[PDB]
Amino acid sequence: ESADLRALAKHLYDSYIKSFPLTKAKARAILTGKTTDKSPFVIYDMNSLMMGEDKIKFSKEVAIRIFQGCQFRSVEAVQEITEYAKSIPGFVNLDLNDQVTLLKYGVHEIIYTMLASLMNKDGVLISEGQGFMTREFLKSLRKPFGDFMEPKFEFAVKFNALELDDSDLAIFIAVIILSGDRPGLLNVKPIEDIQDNLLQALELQLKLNHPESSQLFAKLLQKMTDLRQIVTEHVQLLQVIKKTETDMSLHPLLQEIYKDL
Numbered sequence: 001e002s003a004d005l006r007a008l009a010k011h012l013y014d015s016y017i018k019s020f021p022l023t024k025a026k027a028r029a030i031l032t033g034k035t036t037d038k039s040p041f042v043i044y045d046m047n048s049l050m051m052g053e054d055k056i057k058f059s060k061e062v063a064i065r066i067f068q069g070c071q072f073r074s075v076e077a078v079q080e081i082t083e084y085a086k087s088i089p090g091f092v093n094l095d096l097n098d099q100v101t102l103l104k105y106g107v108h109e110i111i112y113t114m115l116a117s118l119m120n121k122d123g124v125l126i127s128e129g130q131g132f133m134t135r136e137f138l139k140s141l142r143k144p145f146g147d148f149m150e151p152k153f154e155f156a157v158k159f160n161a162l163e164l165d166d167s168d169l170a171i172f173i174a175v176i177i178l179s180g181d182r183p184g185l186l187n188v189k190p191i192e193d194i195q196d197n198l199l200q201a202l203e204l205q206l207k208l209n210h211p212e213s214s215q216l217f218a219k220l221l222q223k224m225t226d227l228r229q230i231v232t233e234h235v236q237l238l239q240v241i242k243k244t245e246t247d248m249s250l251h252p253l254l255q256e257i258y259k260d261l
């Protein structure tokens, strides 16, 4: 019955809002500076970056500070995602070692999915939207850290072209966690039973919310290829900073879900 799917769709969107402080709705409202009830401070070089603290709650180089921000932002999102994931029906019932494995492997694909909500083609919101750092300022950093964000902007523009809203994303990111082809899953079939369910919810949720978009379902499922390549590119980048920056700490949670290859 499609009516139970809808009850599932509503439950997830509700836990989504409850787990993530900055929705896509709030982000698009900040970004279209026609809604100027709260406008972002814009960082665009190092001058802007320095004044961004006379204004915003924010000798140790800048590209690394930039990056250990992106680091501890990633910690932030992982804890919001694991909280969101507990709320997915059946997920907390699963073998504990497999809870950990869906999370290990689904979380980064989910940071970059949601990173798109914060993104347009010129930059990305910062500190839960108070600030907005340009895409070029990012591109300009010290020669290694000078391109880590660049494949996110690449995916985000093409992903944001589908124009999903949060009530669509909440079901999509659930599908991502509940994959079943993650490495090392002891019992995968109950995982596939839940995802069959999430897929059905997602399919009819897109069908009802975007009824002029033939096969948005097929086209949204394809973008899962782009997340996998973002994650690999990122882990490769990550290793170069390790060696060419032996003074560069990394958070052990991030360090923990990063078991490479």
Ligand SMILES: CC1(COc2ccc(CC3=[SH]C(=O)NC3=O)cc2)CCCCC1
Residues within 6 Å of the ligand: 058, 065, 066, 068, 069, 070, 071, 072, 073, 124, 125, 126, 127, 128, 133, 149
């Ligand atoms: C991480 C962003 C936005 O979110 C940020 C928040 C804060 C800082 C700066 C910080 S956070 C800290 O603990 N110390 C700092 O110097 C940087 C970024 C999203 C991903 C793309 C790059 C930017």
